[PDB]
């Protein structure tokens, strides 16, 4: 009666879904009772302090357990053969063979090998001792308590922001580009040049002697005079040893390209010139928008004035600004679209260009860090369309949006969905049809009859980037071209030595197994958008239900009438895509892992023979690489893989429990509970006990969510168990 303090319509609910919907729409601030728009923005703003204070408490937790239970000071000296340590184990359910099988890495008690790879990130930003890691933990624990107290104070009625403070899109975007992006990256080059550059050269720059160590031997004199190439005079050599001064070099902003020879990481010096360069650009781009000083650009005159003539884009972008500034789901949907793509861009650019020292030698770290930021990118990208579909219901105004590009989206909305449905159907026909054709040719003993289309359009790009394995001799494989000859002292010889090395992940050599799987990724990208863009466009109505906007975003159905309307809502159009999302990111991570297993084992032909047909995906990647995983515990004994063996069956269990909420639906279960209510109310001596919230079955929309969560958690825990234990089992 009291727990949904936000929804009194749930407080009058005598059933047990009062508990379930007190949890799930507690952060749906736009539908709480008595919520106003000034009250809306203040709870969102304090909650962002709540997310920030969790992140810094989380990161200070990583700094603490590494400093206390980890072997970072032992891993510094030998960063190849010593395995990293996440946090020690105290499980009193263990047995004695399960204590000694988890003692590894040279430690005392049982430990977990950290596959998150925060050692490689910390080792290259200057962390060398555990005493440097406790200080970072106590620092972020202070900073996390600052953001806890800030979210409390910015709710207090003296310090509550005005409503016009939030809608100032000029001043925020002027401060976050210049200060939060520019000055922060300017300060991070300050951490690189002062601390992280000379720490690799074997020179301790701590808080005690950073005001005594010059970063450069003639420091601040080229910056004030002009000869900025003096900062790139004697760089880290080709025989540098990371962490020592053996062949050290003295440059602070070098522009080499390619990799360090030992670590096979990016150079620290061009990472300093990188974050310096975009710091200059973000500060310069942070002086664009008209806030309070008479100069700058108004957002209300850039959108509306870019209307092309002859009716190409309707009324142009006219009137969008009041539908971006006032709407939050439009702002959230753009942000999840941007962050979700530059989360993949993090993942796509860290296996090929590993930025931290002795990464892409630790293989399980590389496997986890790619697969993590792909599913993190996968969930964020489908939420961009989810909160894009909430925009068309809760925030869209057709009278405000007469004829702009946003309404022309809803105007030709069937042309969008039918052309996505053609591309998704063409790809699924002709990618599966080629694999089945290849599988039959493997089954009939004749591999020569396969369809093996060479990836010409991507090998043309790799040869244009400088990969002379294919011999297109086009631009950078062409030695007499222009772009090869405009950069032989600038940035090319490091980059061209780094591609033509066959044993890094920088522009891997590709064959027809990679033709087929990128089209399968293209299938999975176009079909996941087909489900989601249909969920955005048909959120306001279809011919089956022309008033879908009157019910809201997340409703069960519209009854059995009109032929039956199971899964008609835009929520139910969003949730189907999460299956096709996890499929798609499952396809990008199967292909990433198995091309990297065959690269790191050395049998690079074992992929290209077997990736052309789907049995080789099964009997050479799933069957073959799960040999030591499932042997984590057996009646002979157990080893260090048993925690990943147990999770691998734990993941199959949550997955299949997800089908129970997906195949069985609600009304089989509500009748079953009605027998349990009877058998409770008629049982002697249990009639002493009676419930408060009446037991009812989980609602239709809830059964979607609970089943998708069991589907997705069991999906993630299964593959992460297979990813960590197949990599680290043989490595």
């Amino acid at each position: 009666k009291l727990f949904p303090k936000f929804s009194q319509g749930l407080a009058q609910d005598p059933t047990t879904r009062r508990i379930w919907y007190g949890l799930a729409m507690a952060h749906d601030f736009e539908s709480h009772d008595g919520m106003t728009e000034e009250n809306l923005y203040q709870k969102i703003f304090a909650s962002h302090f709540g997310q920030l204070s969790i992140i810094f408490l989380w990161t200070s937790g990583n700094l603490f357990h590494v400093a206390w239970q980890g072997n970072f000071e032992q891993w510094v000296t030998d960063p190849v053969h010593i395995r990293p340590i996440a946090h020690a184990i105290w499980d009193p359910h263990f047995g004695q063979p399960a204590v000694e099988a988890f003692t590894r890495g040279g430690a005392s008690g049982p430990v977990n090998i950290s596959t998150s790879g925060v050692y490689q990130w910390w080792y290259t930003i200057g962390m060398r001792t555990n005493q440097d890691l406790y200080v970072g933990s106590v620092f972020l624990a202070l900073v996390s308590a600052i953001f806890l107290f800030a979210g409390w104070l910015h709710l207090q009625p003296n310090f509550q922001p005005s409503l016009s403070w939030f809608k100032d899109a000029e001043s925020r975007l002027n401060h976050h580009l210049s200060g939060l992006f520019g000055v922060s990256s300017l300060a991070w080059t300050g951490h690189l040049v002062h601390v992280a550059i000379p720490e690799s050269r074997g020179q301790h720059v701590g808080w005690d002697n950073f005001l005594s160590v010059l970063p450069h031997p003639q420091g601040l004199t080229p910056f004030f005079t002009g000869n900025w190439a003096a900062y790139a005079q004697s760089p880290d050599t080709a025989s540098h040893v990371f962490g020592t001064a053996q062949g050290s070099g003295q440059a602070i902003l070098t522009f080499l390209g390619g990799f360090h020879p030992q670590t096979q990481s990016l150079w620290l010096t061009d990472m300093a010139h990188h974050h310096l360069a975009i710091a200059v650009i973000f500060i310069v781009a942070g002086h664009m928008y008209r806030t309070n000083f008479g100069i700058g650009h108004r957002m209300q005159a850039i959108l509306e004035a870019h209307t092309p003539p002859s009716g190409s884009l309707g009324a142009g972008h006219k009137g969008l600004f009041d539908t971006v500034n006032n709407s939050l789901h439009f702002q959230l949907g753009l942000a999840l679209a941007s962050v979700g793509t530059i989360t993949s861009l993090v993942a796509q650019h860290m296996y090929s260009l590993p930025p931290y020292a002795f990464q892409a030698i630790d293989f399980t770290t590389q496997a986890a860090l790619y697969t993590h930021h792909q599913y993190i990118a996968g969930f964020i990208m489908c939420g961009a369309f989810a909160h894009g579909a909430i925009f068309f219901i809760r925030d869209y105004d057709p009278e405000q949006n007469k004829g702009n590009v946003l309404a022309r989206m809803l105007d030709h909305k069937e042309a969008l969905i039918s052309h996505l449905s053609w591309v998704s159907l063409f790809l699924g026909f002709h990618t599966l049809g080629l694999y089945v054709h290849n599988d039959v040719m493997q089954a009939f003993g004749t591999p020569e009859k396969q369809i093996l289309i060479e990836p010409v359009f991507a090998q043309w790009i790799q040869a244009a980037h400088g990969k002379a394995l294919y011999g297109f001799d086009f631009l950078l494989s062409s030695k007499t071209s222009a772009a090869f000859a405009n950069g032989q002292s600038l940035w090319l010889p490091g980059w061209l030595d780094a591609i033509n090395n066959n044993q890094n992940s920088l522009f891997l050599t590709i064959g027809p197994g990679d033709f087929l799987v990128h089209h399968a990724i293209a299938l999975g990208l176009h079909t996941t958008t087909l489900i989601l863009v249909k969920g955005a466009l048909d959120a306001r109505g279809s011919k089956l239900m022309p008033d879908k906007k009157d019910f809201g975003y997340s409703f069960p159905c519209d009854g059995p009438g009109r032929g039956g309307t199971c899964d008609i809502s835009a929520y139910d159009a969003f949730y189907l895509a999460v299956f096709w999302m996890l499929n798609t990111i499952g396809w990008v991570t199967f292909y990433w892992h198995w091309k990297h297993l065959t690269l790191w084992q050395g049998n690079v032909a074992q992929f290209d023979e077997s990736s052309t047909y789907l049995m080789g995906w099964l009997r050479d990647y799933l069957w073959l690489n799960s040999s030591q995983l499932i042997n984590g515990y057996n009646p002979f004994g157990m080893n260090s893989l048993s925690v990943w063996a147990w999770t691998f069956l734990f993941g199959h269990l949550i997955y299949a429990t997800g089908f129970m909420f997906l195949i069985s639906w609600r009304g089989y279960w509500q009748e079953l509970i009605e027998t349990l209510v009877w058998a409770h109310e008629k049982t002697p001596l249990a009639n002493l006990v009676y419930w408060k919230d009446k037991p009812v079955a989980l609602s239709i929309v809830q059964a979607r969510l609970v089943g998708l969560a069991h589907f997705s958690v069991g999906y993630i825990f299964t593959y992460a168990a297979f990813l960590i234990a197949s990599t680290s089992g043989r490595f």
Binding site: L153, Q156, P157, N158, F159
Partner: peptide, 26 residues
């Protein structure tokens, strides 16, 4: 317990300022 009692004696003055914050805001 040097840095334990010094942080605790710092937390005493920090809590006393928190008694100023717990009143001056409302």
């Amino acid at each position: 317990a040097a840095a334990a009692a010094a942080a605790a004696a710092a937390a005493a003055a920090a809590a006393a300022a928190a008694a100023a914050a717990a009143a001056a805001a409302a």
